[PDB]
From a paper:
Subparticle reconstruction about the I5 vertices improved the resolution of the decameric complex to ∼3.6 Å by the same FSC criteria. Using the molecular modeling software Coot, and guided by secondary structural element predictions from Phyre2 (33), TVV2 CSP residues 37 to 700 were built into a single decamer subunit, denoted capsid shell protein conformer A (CSP-A), nearest the I5 vertex. CSP-A was used as a homology model for building residues 37 to 701 into the alternative subunit (CSP-B) situated further from the I5 vertices. This A-B pair constitutes the principle icosahedral asymmetric unit (IAU) of the viral capsid, and model quality can be observed based on fit in the cryoEM map. Analysis by the Dali server indicated a root mean square deviation (rmsd) of 1.4 Å calculated between all 664 aligned Cα atoms (Z-score = 47.7) of the pair. Notably, we observe an unwinding of α4 and α15 from CSP-A to CSP-B to accommodate the interface with the adjacent CSP-A subunits. As noted in the planar view, channels spanning the width of the capsid shell are located at the I5 vertices. These I5 channels are lined with residues extending from loops between α3 to α4 and β7 to β8 within the apical domain. Closer inspection of the decamer model from the outside reveals the residues lysine 157, arginine 159, and asparagine 255 from all 5 CSP-As lining this channel. The channel measures approximately 9.2 Å in diameter nearest the capsid interior, to 12.8 Å near the exterior, and this contrasts with the 16 to 20 Å I5 channel of TVV1 derived from a lower-resolution cryoEM map in a previous investigation. In the TVV2 CSP-A we observe positively charged residues (R74, K523, R525, K539, R646, and R653) arranged on the cleft exterior generating a positively charged region similar to that observed in ScV-L-A.
Clinical Tv isolates are frequently found infected with one or more strain of the double-stranded RNA (dsRNA) [name] viruses (TVVs), belonging to the Trichomonasvirus genus within totiviruses. Here, we have determined the structure of TVV2 by cryo-electron microscopy (cryoEM) at 3.6 Å resolution and derived an atomic model of its capsid. TVV2 has an icosahedral, T = 2*, capsid comprised of 60 copies of the icosahedral asymmetric unit (a dimer of the two capsid shell protein [CSP] conformers, CSP-A and CSP-B), typical of icosahedral dsRNA virus capsids. Among totiviruses, the single capsid layer is responsible for protecting and sequestering the viral genome while facilitating RdRp activity and the egression of viral mRNA into the cytosol.
Residue numbers in the entry:
A (entry chain B): 37 to 701
B (entry chain A), C (entry chain A): 37 to 700
Write the structure that this text describes.
């Protein structure tokens, strides 16, 4: 019993959303055109070490409006997307909910492992023949996360070509470092990486690279260690690339923050049937580019075999790991927080029994070889943040404002039309700000911003939907981020810890980036209607739609003429009620003031809004309420013409303007 | 005929309880993080000897809630799950009920030794079957208990690095100890270990170490000793690991207190065809860690062989040997009631015939290889007590009070409808405190609790449950602990002298720990809702249910707002409903303090209680009864909000919340 | 529900496949004729050492056709069936699937040795049944593999007379070899034999040669060793032939590479009632050919006795030991894909108990007595690969290509209807070549291929098929070979450095050799017509079928006339059939080169291909697709002639052409 819900569901059924394969196909293979620090210009030559956490590759995209009837031409705007590309952040949390993390099934690792432990094992420990005690939990997650981090290191070094280079292996290990200095990469204020040169662990009897080793032979003993066990044939253990891959994984695991390092120990250790190949501990210049690449390949093969050859969750965890160092940069001065509350993947210490003999499959294009995986991971994340944006805004702007002496019992005041009763909260400013998990959770549980999310994600990803959905929900539940009174100034990565202040002391907490990108990519988009082609506009009625609780963005008939001469086009007068009583009218802006209008007068000096061109803040709630207005016309015609807007962006996907939406017709 | 019990049984059948194997598997590789003393904090450098009997390994677990559609920030709480770490108690008692202790069948042992004797042409008297049956039955129980005790000593001495350790063996054999000094690993008030260096028995003719030895000679008379006989092949008697294991057990048995060295003699006799290797008592440091590890492995091999290759009863007894060192601590004021009443194991002196020529089953994951055997052993006990709590709190909170005018009036004198009429007991304080056994014995044997406890245990364990049920029934049926009126303060391990009296002098004898742990583990949970995720409270009805005796712990809205609202959201006024004489509404707290409510006032001015976030004492029995009360809200429709709760405990298992319950 | 598969199964059932025995019988007495190097020609005098790893024994086979009613003389072609002769590879891997390796039952061995021990009054411990079951299972697999390797070494050294031979034993024991020199029979780059003279183990107290010896004494303890025990009667331990055989095996086992001497220890222990004869290591020439022949015979007798008198599994393992020297070579450009993926045998270390008092079954025709064991062993492998090829090429040619724009587009991008949609794979060349295992594993496990491969193998072999099926499935499921883009040139044995890229970079991974051999042998043949006798072609329809993707090898008329006509017999013109817009007919070759056909022209000017008489590459996948083409003849009705083909191969068997097929 909800007409809007059923209408939207039927629409989404009519025009299925574009599954992610198109996004991957489009983004996989273009190099960035130019990379520069977010605020300013790049220097002549890049410094020795990435040290300013603002460098961001950007993706230009512009809009030009064009129409006859206006006084002068309209200047073009630059809707460009940015990618953080330097700053670090955590993404792994221990919390969980039912679907947040699942354990794989060792239904094809147990037969072989038992048949290989029954024969080559001293004939005095007894016959095992039970195939039921080999039931340790199967959680091969953290390996993929570390793999992703390693790929991220490689990509970050490639993009920001430093002046004096070093081999990726050399930079990662950091042989020629100082006592407690930062690694060659990731050396800045926010950097979180174990400093100092990496230390090889020890010179024990049974070594097989960085991890422990146990053999199964007659004149020996057998005792499976506690962590994970990767049972492999003697052929590969004595191979070369595999040893290098193990060393690389170990190396990237010891650069995590010390505390998080203690939480999730690197417990891998291999068991086979041949003599232990002593640890090699490469140093100075043993590993080189091609050898590293070969090791990466073999490692990917190993991980795929560990995942029961799933390759869709593998790519998921790999993306999530690579996301600690690449991520989209917000676009609105509000502060770019919608991402910060959706970035956590639950995890558990790795464990289980794994057997690896061959390949069992071949994937045409794995993530680790696609010409800068960082960008593709960042955009793969953005294509989800935008869907979340679309679902939250399904009802209204969902503002959160500040008022002094607000009741510390309930924080729900009605703001007027265009803001549904549920949303539109308020909070005292002089006390610590709210936690921002006290709103989102309340938003994504209702059976209107839930089913939409369900079906949209289902169409985007298909069978491997639940995992993402479940996980993101968990992220929302425990997010410590808080709302703040500051601005990002649109040329920063983080709020400058000075005294930026809000224009209206309020924050809209459901906008992350302009919906135009959502339309272009084909994903779901809401509210705001698309602007790419000829449009019939009726100012005399569009403006009316505005003052009764709209937003200017839908009203592309106004922005065109905002200061091109709208003045001598339309007048506003209080009301001409021919009967009961001649009362006067007024309107309320996003602030509290309720300045009124008494007589006929040109519109240009009653509202007088800032003119950006044809790209205004979509959820700014310019006017909340207004009663008693007429909007007379002051020119025959000249208020029922045409307008043409052209937007060309480099990320136009395959099915660009054929996606579901429910913006006013 | 009872409907509630039928409903509970049906629900339990439909939703099976979690198998024990998951709980075992999820602890094998748990790394502890806190080893602080229970009360204070770790000193800079660890001592040289385990003296303060207050240390505890703390399994931290955090819960924090949030008020959806509000700007309030409730501080996060802490589920402090404490495991006692240095304190000695006894879990052995020679008193058994019919099913308590079984007799492992010697079906596969007698024929092998018969054939051995026949092959080596030894002249024995009488068919070995009847002589085995009457002369020596087959009870190997003891030899597993000592093994568990040894593992526990190792684990204890490992976790608490005493600033200059020696070895497992050097702190066990008491080399360089004064004749009155206590062993290094256990030196504190009221310990349970004999002191001074242990003395090896005199070297007689034939010895296989610390126990007698008898060799079987061709064409020569053979007569068995009186204890237990462990026939072995000659290849093993000359092994170093075997003798080292034997020595370690002998040492562990001569360290338990003096009086139990004359009731459970460690009698054993190795029999083989070798030449008596003679005892080679290790004297100086000569038992290195790898040698001790090999000793433990071979020992577990022999033990598992003796138990007819069962590995389940063996695991049970090995664990029961460990609680003598590692115990699960209580989480309430008047604790040490459930654990103190379920620890004993019925036992018989070690005797019978055994045979070990080679191992047959390869146990993949024995106890002693876990990350820390103490923790694994303690958690299983915790599960047992959790289920026992679940069954006990099936029909109320089971209060016991100390009212001076106890004789003048009968029971149900003070406890209104809250405490189910039939589960409240009183006793005048002139006499000493009663014996807890009296109450628990009557509690357990009611058909309603029996028929459910049996099913729960059977689901948890399976074919091996009956031993555990019988043993716990015996233990609870045999307990000397008294319900002492004093308090524990929840910041100690042993009750300190001079502690203050309990709250209202009413001990509650069901609680041992919060049920959230039981929910997380996926085991049977009592009638408490699981604070897991999104909740939709309604403060009016919720509050009304409280004043009918219900537990505040089932009221989420109140706990969330305990000090952040409820002074501007809800009021209390007397009911003026009919035209009859107006009456002053009143409600009765636990101690019989009838409280009158004459003039309507904000709730926070009529009733109070400490704010523990959302973790309040489950069965605190706050309001016994109330009559004539009304609750009206004074907020413009924002008294029906939503809350979110997150419980990220580190001991969550596979069956997260799939376990049965009473009030879903 | 699948009709094609049902038809194939019905046809296979109606026409049984040839039993393996005929193939074995038709090779026992085959005399090879050519021993030239694969590439060049035999030098005047043979070398003194086997170095060039390119020699091959060539089984020549000739086919020549004739155009009935014509004066043309097509030159005779040559089915070059090459058998690699000096090249070492490994066919051992410790990785098994459930049916891969069985455990021969010790039903008839334990009782005999039990009775022997009882008769000789030896004091043993424990009934031998359970000790056999747990302490030592019965896997004699290894000792047959070494025997096969020894036979193979003999055969290799025999065929290639190295201009001054010494003996089987003098080239095996490495007498007079430098500490770095390699053994005479195997001295070349990337060999697989340990170098230098082999060193005898030290002479201890009791030895029956190169292995330990234990005698059973009346009224004396007896304890078995840890490896395998081979009880024998005293009459044999003192025999010369037995010890010579034992020495030969020991020598062969110490010559295989160093790293497999520590994973498959040659552990054995003779047990008897004699006096330890002591090791008598032959040192100078003292193993004459007749003595070695006797050694081999007695050895095969003992082996057959150990295998429960099976002689089928024994033959299989003996053969599998030989391919390590003799392999069947490929007959295509991108070969070494099928044989490289089906060679491994799952194995377990040698152990258990055995008993040999006298032979019981007299195998008439053992392997080692054949004219040349290498050839006989290689041919059986060839049969296995032939059947495997037959099953693989059941639904198309299974192409794999290297297109740079692989990611941008999905599969079926280039391969028209010719390559069954679902059997074409691509990969960008930026990454290294994929693993062949990935493709083959998916190929084999489809139900359609499984249900036919099983039946084919069962018909060929019988009760012993399941071992072979399981072992081949394991091997193919475990292969490290990569699909390297390079070419082989068909005039070598090992891929030479610097060879040119493949044709269109598209490897085809079904072909191993021409199906005419499979037809002749009477085994299952893929969907290729057998060019046997009189044929009645019709060039028009035949040519039309080609341009629908069919294989040119099924078009006899075209191949016969490839360069003798088809420039004056048939023309190609665009189809002008309807009144719609005329369109330029086009056809697409393998590499996606769309070819337009605008003006009608003689066929030889539109399409070309090399003339190999009538033996063209079977699955070359010439024309993927074509649309809008017409074929009209310009000869006065002499385009429907007859042809004759004669295939007088020297390895024809009884079931000449009675085997099943797909397109009869």
């Amino acid at each position: 019993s909800n007409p809007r819900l059923t209408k939207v569901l039927d629409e989404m059924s009519k025009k299925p959303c574009v599954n992610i394969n198109e996004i991957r196909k489009m983004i996989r293979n273009f190099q960035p055109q130019f990379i520069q620090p977010r605020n300013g210009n790049r220097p002549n030559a890049q410094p020795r070490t990435v040290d300013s956490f603002e460098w961001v590759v950007r993706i230009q995209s512009t809009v030009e409006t064009q129409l006859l009837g206006a006084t002068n031409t309209v200047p073009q705007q630059t809707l460009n997307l940015d990618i953080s590309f330097t700053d670090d952040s955590t993404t792994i949390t221990p919390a969980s909910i039912p679907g947040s993390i699942s354990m794989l099934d060792n239904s094809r690792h147990i037969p072989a492992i038992q048949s290989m432990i029954q024969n080559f094992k001293a004939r005095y420990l007894g016959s095992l023949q039970d195939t039921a005690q080999l039931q340790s939990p199967q959680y091969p997650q953290l390996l993929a996360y570390l793999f992703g981090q390693l790929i991220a290191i490689k990509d970050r070094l490639d993009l920001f070509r430093p002046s004096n280079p070093l081999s990726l292996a050399d930079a990662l290990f950091g042989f020629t470092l100082a006592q407690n200095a930062r690694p060659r990469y990731d050396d800045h204020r926010h950097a979180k990486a174990c400093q100092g040169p990496l230390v090889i662990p020890a010179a024990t009897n049974s070594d097989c690279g960085p991890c422990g080793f146990v053999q199964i032979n007659a004149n020996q003993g057998l005792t499976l260690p506690l962590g994970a066990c990767l049972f492999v044939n003697p052929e590969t253990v004595n191979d070369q690339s595999f040893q290098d891959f193990l060393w690389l994984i170990f190396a990237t695991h010891h650069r995590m923050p010390n505390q998080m390092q203690n939480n999730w120990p690197f417990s891998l250790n291999i068991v086979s049937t041949c003599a232990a190949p002593g640890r090699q501990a490469p140093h100075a210049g043993e590993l080189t580019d091609e050898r590293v690449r070969l090791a990466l390949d073999t490692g990917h093969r190993i991980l795929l075999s560990m995942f029961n050859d799933d390759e869709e969750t593998l790519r998921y965890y790999q993306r999530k790991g690579i996301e600690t160092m690449f991520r989209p940069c917000c676009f609105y001065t509000e502060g770019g927080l919608l991402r910060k509350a959706t970035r956590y993947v639950s995890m558990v210490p790795l464990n289980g029994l794994y057997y690896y003999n061959g390949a069992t499959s071949y994937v045409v294009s794995p993530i680790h070889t696609d010409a800068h995986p960082g960008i593709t991971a960042a955009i793969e994340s953005f294509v989800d943040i935008m869907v979340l944006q679309a679902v939250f805004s399904f009802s209204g702007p969902k503002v959160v404002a500040a008022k002094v002496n607000a009741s510390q019992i309930d924080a729900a005041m009605v703001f007027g039309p265009a803001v549904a009763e549920g949303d539109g909260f308020v909070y005292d400013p002089l006390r610590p700000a709210p936690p921002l998990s006290a709103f989102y959770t309340e938003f994504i549980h209702r059976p209107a911003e839930q089913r939409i999310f369900q079906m949209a994600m289902s169409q985007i990803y298909g069978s491997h939907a639940p995992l993402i959905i479940a996980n993101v929900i968990n992220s929302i539940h425990n997010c410590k981020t808080k709302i703040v009174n500051n601005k990002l100034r649109a040329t920063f990565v983080r709020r400058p810890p000075g005294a930026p202040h809000l224009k209206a002391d309020t924050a809209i907490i459901n906008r992350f980036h302009d919906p135009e990108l959502a339309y272009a990519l084909g994903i779901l988009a809401d509210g705001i209607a698309p602007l790419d082609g000829s449009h019939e506009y009726n100012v005399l009625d569009e403006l009316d739609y505005l003052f009764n609780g709209g937003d200017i963005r839908n009203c592309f008939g106004l922005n065109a003429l905002n200061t091109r001469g709208l003045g001598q086009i339309v007048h506003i007068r209080p009301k001409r009620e021919p009967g009961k009583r001649p009362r006067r009218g007024f309107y309320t802006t996003l602030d509290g003031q309720v300045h009124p209008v008494t007589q006929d007068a040109p519109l240009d000096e009653i509202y007088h809004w800032r003119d950006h061109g044809n790209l205004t803040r979509p959820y700014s709630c310019h006017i909340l309420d207004s009663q008693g207005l007429e909007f007379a016309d002051v020119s025959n015609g000249r208020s029922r013409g045409k307008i043409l807007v052209v937007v060309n962006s480099p990320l136009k996907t395959c099915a660009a303007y054929q996606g579901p939406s429910f913006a006013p017709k």
